[PDB]
């Protein structure tokens, strides 16, 4: 069945468009990440990582 769209129709019957971005998180090799600068490495000292 096909829709019939006309400007006479008000809200509810007025056509809508839906855009979906769907992530997925997993403990797998990450390939997408945001614009954040990397840093160097330190060893044997209590640090944040």
């Amino acid at each position: 069945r096909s829709y019939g769209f006309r400007p006479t129709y008000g809200v509810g019957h007025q056509p809508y468009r839906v855009v979906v971005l769907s992530f997925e998180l997993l403990h797998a090799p990450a390939t997408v990440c945001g614009p954040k600068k990397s840093t160097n490495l330190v060893k044997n000292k209590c640090v944040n990582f």
């Binding site: 008000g10 809200v11 509810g12 019957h13």
Partner: protein
């Protein structure tokens, strides 16, 4: 002509089949807030009135 708030009408319905997915054509709206019952499941429930 819809009745004013100070005098509203009411109809009590009984002794008939309960089909509820057909009302989408005879009344324009946007929400269909069926808080109590899932709309698609009304085909099976038996109601008092």
């Amino acid at each position: 002509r819809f009745a004013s708030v100070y005098a509203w009408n009411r109809k009590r319905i009984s002794n008939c089949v309960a089909d509820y997915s057909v009302l989408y054509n005879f009344a324009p709206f946007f929400a269909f807030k069926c808080y109590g019952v899932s709309p698609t499941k009304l085909n099976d429930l038996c109601f008092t009135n």
